[PDB]
Design a protein around this ligand. Structure first.
Ligand SMILES: CCCCCCCCCCCCCCCCCC(=O)OC[C@H](COP(=O)([O-])OCC[N+](C)(C)C)OC(=O)CCCCCCCCCCCCCCCCC
Ligand SMILES: CCCCCCCCCCCCCCCCCC(=O)OC[C@H](COP(=O)([O-])OCC[N+](C)(C)C)OC(=O)CCCCCCCCCCCCCCCCC
Ligand SMILES: CCCCCCCCCCCCCCCCCC(=O)OC[C@H](COP(=O)([O-])OCC[N+](C)(C)C)OC(=O)CCCCCCCCCCCCCCCCC
Ligand SMILES: CCCCCCCCCCCCCCCCCC(=O)OC[C@H](COP(=O)(O)OCCN)OC(=O)CCCCCCCCCCCCCCCCC
Ligand SMILES: CCCCCCCCCCCCCCCCCC(=O)OC[C@H](COP(=O)(O)OCCN)OC(=O)CCCCCCCCCCCCCCCCC
Ligand SMILES: CCCCCCCCCCCCCCCCCC(=O)OC[C@H](COP(=O)(O)OCCN)OC(=O)CCCCCCCCCCCCCCCCC
Ligand SMILES: CCCCCCCCCCCCCCCCCC(=O)OC[C@H](COP(=O)(O)OCCN)OC(=O)CCCCCCCCCCCCCCCCC
Ligand SMILES: CCCCCCCCCCC1=C(C)C(=O)C(OC)=C(OC)C1=O
Ligand code: SF4
Ligand code: SF4
Ligand code: SF4
Lengths: 80, 314, 110, 97, 176, 156, 70, 360
């Protein structure tokens, strides 16, 4: 399998570079520790208005003010 | 006041296309161990003026055209599309600040092959028509790698906005993460403009040999407007300059120097290489640039995701 | 509106220069010319290969048209599906190129 | 810095033609501004110049007269305006003016 | 006593194969050619400033024809028709007679400059150095018959160019 | 008058532009082609006069006939001259284009290109040197400089 | 020598410098000494039309600050 | 795209040269050979001179032979510069054309200093050369030769390793050795196919048995190996020029038979026999003994030969001119089968074709 690689790298190095770049593009997002952060950043981006909830009386994880401690925080994005 | 801005765009385009001819003749002179024009003006500065006045009073060839209307519309379309490719160019501010300036430029350069096609069919020579069809097939071939290289780059931009492409390159030139895209882009812009080593309209009779000298000068100046424009677009795209919003002329001087050096690089490439045979540049597109361009298109799709560097939409 | 003004100015400058280039040497009264091509009078021979490269352009350009919303598509929250379908469209353009290759479709204009 | 010596040589080429007027005179007639040692002047007003630092072909030249045999040769310089005694020297048939 | 151009079998180890692949993908020889063209960009060109600067010549140069005279005013040509006998293009037409003092002199000495091949066989056939092919090359005309020289035109060319022709012959007659 | 002054200045303008941008179509027939190529070579360099190197025949200003015109190529010369747009000029370079030359008495040679086309400059030599050909091109430029097209038009 | 080509490059470079300098100065002249408002999206156009209405003089670039409230 | 048939119609420069030779004397018919292969002037002069001298049973003096070989190799440089640079100019490499025509211009100055004409010298004559070298010429030929290798180096830097130039020449115009012998090819057209044949080695003339040089042999028969053979023949021509400059002997330059070569003008104007011989050589010409020779040299285009027939008079009965371009352009149709329209211009380039020697 090693003689085939040197043979095609001597004859057709454009296609070797092509299949190498394509194979890296296929396998490498499933191996990266940062692929989680792409999804986390895309769901942290507020295109819409954050429509508030009617306070029934029992929602301890929903804040009453933006500067309240509870709620989703973005210190992971400020730090990274 | 806006019409003043339109004229201060389009009249210096015509002047820079006029003097690009002089710069080409001089630089190709000194690279060929000779001088260029230095008799007509001081340092040849009146050579484009003399040559334009010569061409505009040269006799018409007065040919038999199949269509009079397409024989009129091919220079009109060539000049109009050569002038409309400049209006979204951010330098540092575009004339028309449109949200899809990249896609607009890609579309209006895709429309430029009708000048070649209509001018080839308007000539009654079958050989001129065959050469026109070869030029059209060459140009629409290299449009593919234009579109895909441009898409792969703008996956780092986030939008088709040309003005955002300055914001993208504030920390680094975009030729650093995309130099294989940049070099295939540069050769594809070299093959879009029928520019050497891809000038098979001068290899052994092109599409526009049947026009008069006036309309041939109009095709020629549309082609050089396309050359200067694609160099400016390449400079905006990969070699993006520093911009102070309180001092815009710094960006204007910086991109102007880079675009001049890139146009002189076109001049210096035509003074260095033999032509391709036609199947050899088809081989260069379909069998060399397009597999690499698809591989790097997969790479620039998947790379902002694996590095968490997806650019903003706005 | 500014775009329509600019397009009209570009078209008007182009039509003006074309009219000047077609009618400034017509003022000269040079002479009437009689003047009684590599092919002599033969009909234009069709080549299948130019038509094949034009259709191959059209098909890959439709695949490009599918590929064009990718910089906006990367902003989604379904990134695994977006990445799979993006790599799948570029792979199908590659498979179309490979089938055009290996069945001698890219030959004598390679 | 040696760019400064280049620009000083340009300024003394302006000085060497007797200022900006004679400088522009030789610039628009000769398309060339470099100064040489005046080898001589014939009976017509043609002036003959050496510069042995120039390469072989540039090292001898003529600035043609502005009037010869009644003709206004200010812009209409002519290669056959050179008399035969200077035609050996200018065409390098001899070293001797 | 011979050599083989292009008979090098290239090395197939990973070093040389990677060198050739880097040349293919990174375009090294194309940058080499661009560098050589850039190196000529900064050389001084070889262009002389014609008409003010002239191309170098030699006293052997074969230009415009001339009939010469002695240092007494008497013309050298004694009508022997050797120049028109040796003339490879038959450009010279000569008719002669004895003139009023009985000298052997021509009455017709035509040179068609549009038949002439400018090879100077006439000036080396000439036993008295009468015909020469002088140093003038800048004698283009606007009309064809202005290049059909008669004896008057050739004698006027000799009177015009003798100060240069005699010095060129003085430079070159020891090689003849 | 005033119109005489205007047509004088306009003739000077159009003659400046035509002589300062001459484009040659060179017939590389015979040995004179090599010396035309030396007139284009970097020592003499026609392009510094605005005289470009190898314009196409449908856009050229002067036809430089450089070499022997044989009888088998006389209609090809005439056809190229008929396809040239006006003002077209013809420079006859060297003795075979001028009067047949060394092949004047041949069965197969047109005795001078002036039998086929009208000729403006006759450049003599076998071959004429590249400096002599450049002299002939500058004499052609002086011939264009003294043209009186609009002045004769104003007097007709 | 090679600096003979620099006058043509200077003329062409000034001609390339002119359009960007012109559009920068025309944008600052037509928009109150500032950049032209970039409205690629309908929220930016909404705020711009709000500025044109709150300025009172039918010009979005006439800015109104704390002095326009009590 | 493919070329099925290539039919070259020629005769557009047929000027009836060798019928015009039949009415002119041997000295008078010498300058027709300047104009056949009109980039290889003194080589054709040498071929005609060797033909006439072979029929005359005389030989040139040694200094004449060394001058003829010196200017034959200067001429070989001229022709290979023309060949390589116009073969690249037609393909599209326009720049080494201009780079090499200044060295070409300096060699035309060498011709003009030795004869008076820049191209058609009429300098190599039957009997020797017409005139001796002027003083200071060999020093300037040395100053040229000292620098010309770098000019070949930068030409070869532009074209040889360039991938575009290799794609225009590597599988183009491939000629087998047996077809090249059968089609009558000569010179590089043989040696590109591997045929070890050069007439300056095998059938040597004037002093080529005394100069030492190598012969570039191709291996594939294509346009590219013929290109490399012409570049290496420029190299080896510089080698021969150095050996000619160092080994130039003293002595006369015409044969000292005043019934063949004309006497000096100092003794023509003094001696009776010399004036009679000057008269008869410039009016009648010398008589050549009756016979037919075929004398061929290795011109820079290939075997350039003269089949020269004398009947006893001072004018040739017949002068057939064998030129390499005739057979090479007859082989053009075979060499272009299975190739493309932009390959035919490379094949007409690699066959160094000048139509003065093709059509006569
Ligand atoms: C925008 C600013 C300027 C940009 C740069 C451009 C400036 C310089 C321009 C020079 C003049 C060029 C004139 C035209 C030349 C045209 C000919 C030519 O070059 O053809 C292209 C040639 C064509 O190949 P070819 O024709 O030479 O080779 C023969 C081809 N076969 C075998 C098919 C017959 O090469 C390419 O197509 C390469 C394009 C760029 C490739 C970039 C690869 C990047 C690295 C990938 C990874 C490699 C490592 C291995 C994997 C590692 C993984 C971690
Ligand atoms: C912006 C880029 C550059 C723009 C173009 C250059 C600017 C100048 C344009 C006008 C040039 C001068 C007029 C056209 C050329 C005249 C040459 C010519 O052939 O003249 C003879 C021609 C014809 O004269 P003719 O009667 O002698 O015809 C010659 C042909 N025969 C004899 C066989 C019939 O004259 C004219 O056409 C005169 C028309 C008016 C001249 C101009 C008026 C003022 C314009 C301002
Ligand atoms: C061959 C096809 C290969 C790709 C198949 C789909 C891959 C993928 O990501 O699917 C998930 C995607 C999307 O799943 P999802 O999990 O993103 O769905 C969430 C719902 N939305 C998108 C509205 C937020 O597709 C599907 O689940 C259904 C469509 C594809 C079904 C399979 C088609 C097979 C065709 C065979 C012929
Ligand atoms: C899995 C990731 C995604 C993969 C798909 C997307 C890839 C992106 C690039 C698309 C390219 C499309 C066209 C490819 C066609 C391949 C087949 C081919 O060309 O075969 C013919 C060729 C011989 O060439 P010839 O027929 O003469 O053609 C004229 C040129 N000489 O034969 C050859 O040249 C032989 C070439 C085949 C071997 C290449 C090996 C490369 C190895 C790289 C490292 C490992 C990569 C692993 C990925 C999977 C590999 C199978
Ligand atoms: C963004 C900037 C872009 C700039 C682009 C242009 C750059 C180069 C500009 C030109 C530079 C200077 C050129 C001078 C040329 C020579 C003019 C001249 O002197 O002509 C002399 C001629 C005959 O004069 P005469 O009196 O006969 O002479 C005998 C004297 N004893 O007399 C005549 O010919 C008559 C007079 C003609 C004068 C013409 C001068 C040049 C015209 C240039 C027009 C365009 C200039 C730029 C426009 C925009 C900026 C203002
Ligand atoms: C033979 C005939 C003659 C041939 C020569 C002349 C024609 C060819 C050359 C001219 C081509 C005309 C192109 C017209 C449309 C161009 C596309 C376009 O409008 O893109 C710009 C922009 C899109 O970007 P975006 O920023 O999203 O929009 C603004 C929102 N803030 O969108 C905008 O800014 C929208 C602006 C308003 C809409 C403009 C519509 C223009 C008029 C309709 C087309 C007229 C031309 C018809 C013929 C075309 C060619 C066949
Ligand atoms: C009421 C009065 C006015 C009537 C209408 C006139 C309109 C303006 C026309 C321009 C002025 C008229 C004179 C035109 C030139 C005539 C004089 C001339 O040619 O002088 C010769 C001189 C150079 O001498 P020469 O012999 O050519 O050089 C040999 C080399 N040493 O040549 C020179 O020095 C250079 C001459 C340059 C010519 C003028 C500059 C170019 C044209 C500018 C106007 C047109 C521009 C149009 C747009 C072009 C494209 C951008
Ligand atoms: C509105 C008109 C502006 C001036 C016309 C365009 C600028 C002048 C270019 C002249 C020119 C040059 C120098 C030139 O070299 C050339 O040949 C390749 C041309 O094509 C025919 C040209 O048109
Ligand atoms: S130079 Fe030659 S062709 Fe001319 S006249 Fe003299 S002998 Fe005849
Ligand atoms: S020019 Fe000389 S050779 Fe000719 S006829 Fe006169 S004297 Fe004799
Ligand atoms: S005039 Fe003479 S040198 Fe010139 S091309 Fe003709 S034969 Fe050759």
């Amino acid at each position: 399998v090693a003689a085939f690689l040197k043979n095609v790298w001597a004859k057709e190095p454009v296609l070797v570079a092509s299949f190498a770049i394509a194979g890296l593009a296929v396998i490498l997002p499933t191996l990266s520790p940062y692929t989680k952060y792409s999804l986390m950043i895309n769901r942290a981006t507020p295109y819409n208005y954050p429509v508030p909830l009617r306070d029934d009386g029992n929602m301890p994880d929903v804040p009453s003010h933006p500067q309240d401690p509870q709620g989703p925080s973005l210190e992971w994005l400020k730090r990274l | 006041m806006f019409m003043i801005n339109v004229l201060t765009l389009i009249i210096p385009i015509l002047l820079a296309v006029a003097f690009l001819t002089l710069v080409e003749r001089k630089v190709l002179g000194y690279m060929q161990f000779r001088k260029g024009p230095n008799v007509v003006g001081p340092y040849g500065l009146l050579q484009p003026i003399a040559d334009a006045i010569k061409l505009f009073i040269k006799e018409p060839l007065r040919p038999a055209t199949s269509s009079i209307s397409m024989f009129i519309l091919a220079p009109i379309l060539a000049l109009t599309l050569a002038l409309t490719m400049w209006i979204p160019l951010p330098m540092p501010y575009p004339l028309i600040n449109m949200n899809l300036g990249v896609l607009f430029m890609l579309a209006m350069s895709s429309l430029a092959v009708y000048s070649i096609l209509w001018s080839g069919w308007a000539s009654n020579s079958k050989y001129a028509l065959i050469g026109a069809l070869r030029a059209v097939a060459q140009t629409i071939s290299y449009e593919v790698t234009l579109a895909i290289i441009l898409l792969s780059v703008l996956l780092m931009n986030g939008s088709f906005t040309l003005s955002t492409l300055i914001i993208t390159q504030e920390q680094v030139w975009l030729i650093f993460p995309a130099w294989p895209l940049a070099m295939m882009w540069f050769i594809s812009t070299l093959a879009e403009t029928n520019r050497a080593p891809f000038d098979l309209t001068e290899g052994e009779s092109g599409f526009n040999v049947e026009y008069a000298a006036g309309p041939f000068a109009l095709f020629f100046m549309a082609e050089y407007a396309n050359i200067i424009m694609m160099n400016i677009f390449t400079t905006t795209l990969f070699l993006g300059a520093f911009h102070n919003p309180y001092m815009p002329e710094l960006y204007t001087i910086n991109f102007t120097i880079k675009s001049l050096l890139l146009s002189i690089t076109f001049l210096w490439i035509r003074a260095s290489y033999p032509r391709f045979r036609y199947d050899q540049l088809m081989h260069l597109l379909w069998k060399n640039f397009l597999p690499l361009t698809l591989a790097l298109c997969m790479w620039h799709v998947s790379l902002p995701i694996l590095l968490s560097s997806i650019p903003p939409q706005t | 509106m500014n775009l329509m003004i600019t397009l009209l100015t570009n078209f008007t400058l182009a039509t003006l220069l074309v009219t000047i280039a077609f009618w400034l040497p017509q003022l000269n009264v040079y002479s009437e010319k009689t003047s009684p091509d590599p092919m002599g009078s033969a009909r234009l021979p069709f080549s299948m290969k130019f038509f094949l490269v034009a259709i191959t352009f059209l098909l890959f350009d439709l695949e490009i048209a599918l590929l064009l919303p990718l910089p906006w598509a990367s902003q989604t929250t379904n990134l695994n599906t977006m990445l799979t379908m993006a790599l799948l469209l570029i792979f199908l353009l590659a498979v179309s190129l490979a089938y055009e290759w290996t069945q001698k479709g890219l030959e004598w204009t390679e | 810095m040696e760019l400064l010596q280049v620009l000083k040589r340009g300024l003394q080429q302006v000085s060497g033609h007797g200022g900006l007027r004679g400088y522009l005179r030789v610039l628009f007639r000769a398309n060339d501004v470099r100064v040489g040692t005046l080898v001589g002047e014939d009976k017509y007003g043609n002036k003959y110049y050496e510069d042995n630092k120039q390469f072989f072909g540039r090292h001898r030249w003529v600035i043609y007269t502005t009037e010869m045999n009644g003709k206004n040769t200010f812009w209409d310089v002519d290669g056959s305006m050179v008399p035969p005694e200077w035609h050996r020297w200018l065409h390098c048939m001899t070293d001797d003016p | 006593t011979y050599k083989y151009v292009n008979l090098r079998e290239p090395s197939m180890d990973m070093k040389s194969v990677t060198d050739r692949a880097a040349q293919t993908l990174l375009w090294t020889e194309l940058i080499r050619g661009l560098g050589m063209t850039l190196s000529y960009l900064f050389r001084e060109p070889a262009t002389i400033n014609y008409p003010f600067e002239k191309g170098p010549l030699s006293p052997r140069f074969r230009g415009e024809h001339a009939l010469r005279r002695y240092p007494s005013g008497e013309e050298r040509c004694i009508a022997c028709k050797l120049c028109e006998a040796v003339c490879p293009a038959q450009a010279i037409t000569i008719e002669a007679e004895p003139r009023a003092d009985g000298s052997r002199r021509t009455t017709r000495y035509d040179i068609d400059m549009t038949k002439c091949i400018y090879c100077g066989f006439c000036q080396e056939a000439c036993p008295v150095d009468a015909i020469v092919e002088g140093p003038n090359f800048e004698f283009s005309t606007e009309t064809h018959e202005e290049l059909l020289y008669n004896k008057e035109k050739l004698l006027n060319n000799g009177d015009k160019w003798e100060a240069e022709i005699a010095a060129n012959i003085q430079a070159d007659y020891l090689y003849r | 008058s005033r119109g005489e002054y205007v047509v004088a200045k306009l003739d000077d303008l159009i003659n400046w532009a035509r002589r300062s941008s001459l484009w040659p179509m060179t017939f590389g027939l015979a040995c004179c082609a090599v010396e035309m190529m030396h007139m284009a070579a970097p020592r003499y360099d026609m392009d510094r006069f605005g005289v470009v190197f190898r314009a196409s025949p449908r856009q050229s200003d002067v036809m430089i006939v450089a070499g022997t015109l044989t009888n088998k190529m006389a209609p090809a010369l005439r056809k190229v001259y008929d396809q040239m747009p006006e003002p077209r000029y013809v420079v006859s370079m060297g003795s075979c284009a001028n009067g047949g030359g060394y092949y004047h008495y041949s069965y197969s040679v047109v005795r001078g290109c002036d039998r086929i086309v009208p000729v403006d400059i006759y450049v003599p030599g076998c071959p004429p040197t590249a400096e002599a050909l450049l002299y002939g091109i500058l004499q052609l430029q002086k011939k264009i400089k003294r043209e009186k097209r609009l002045r004769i038009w104003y007097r007709r | 020598m090679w600096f003979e080509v620099l006058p043509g490059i200077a003329v062409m470079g000034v001609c390339l410098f002119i359009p960007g300098m012109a559009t920068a100065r025309i944008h600052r002249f037509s928009n109150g000494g500032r950049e032209k408002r970039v409205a690629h999206y309908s929220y930016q156009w909404y705020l711009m039309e709000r500025d044109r209405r709150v300025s009172g003089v039918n010009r979005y670039y006439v800015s109104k600050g704390l002095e326009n409230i009590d | 795209e493919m070329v099925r048939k290539c039919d070259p119609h020629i005769g557009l420069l047929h000027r009836g040269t060798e019928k015009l030779i039949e009415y002119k004397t041997y000295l008078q018919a010498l300058p027709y050979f300047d104009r056949l292969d009109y980039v290889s002037m003194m080589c054709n002069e040498q071929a005609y001179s060797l033909a006439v001298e072979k029929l005359l049973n005389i030989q040139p003096p040694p200094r004449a032979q060394w001058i003829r070989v010196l200017f034959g190799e200067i001429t070989r440089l001229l022709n290979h510069i023309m060949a390589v640079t116009t073969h690249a100019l037609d393909i599209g490499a326009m720049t080494p054309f201009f780079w090499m025509f200044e060295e070409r211009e300096k060699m035309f100055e060498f011709y003009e200093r030795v004869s008076g004409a820049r191209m058609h010298a009429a300098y190599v004559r039957p009997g020797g050369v017409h005139q001796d070298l002027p003083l200071g010429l060999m020093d300037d030929i040395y100053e040229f030769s000292k620098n010309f290798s770098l000019r070949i180096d930068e030409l070869e830097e532009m074209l040889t390793n360039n991938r575009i130039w290799r794609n225009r020449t590597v599988d183009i115009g491939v000629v087998t050795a047996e077809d090249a012998l059968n089609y009558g090819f000569s010179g590089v057209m043989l040696r590109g196919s591997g045929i070890q044949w050069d007439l300056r080695k095998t059938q040597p003339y004037d002093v080529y048995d005394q100069v030492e040089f190598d012969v570039p042999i191709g291996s594939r028969g294509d346009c590219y190996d013929r290109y490399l053979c012409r570049v290496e023949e420029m190299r080896q021509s510089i080698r021969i020029i150095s050996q000619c400059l160092n080994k130039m002997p003293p002595g006369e330059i015409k044969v000292d038979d005043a019934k063949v070569s004309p006497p000096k003008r100092a003794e023509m104007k003094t001696s009776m026999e010399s004036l009679i011989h000057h008269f008869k050589l410039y009016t009648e010409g010398y008589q050549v003994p009756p016979g037919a020779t075929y004398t061929a040299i290795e011109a820079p285009k290939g075997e350039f030969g003269v089949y020269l027939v004398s009947d006893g008079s001072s004018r040739p009965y017949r002068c057939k001119i064998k030129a390499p371009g005739f057979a090479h352009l007859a082989g053009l149709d075979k060499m272009s089968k299975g190739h493309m329209l932009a390959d035919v211009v490379a094949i007409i380039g690699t066959q160094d074709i000048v139509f003065g020697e093709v059509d006569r």
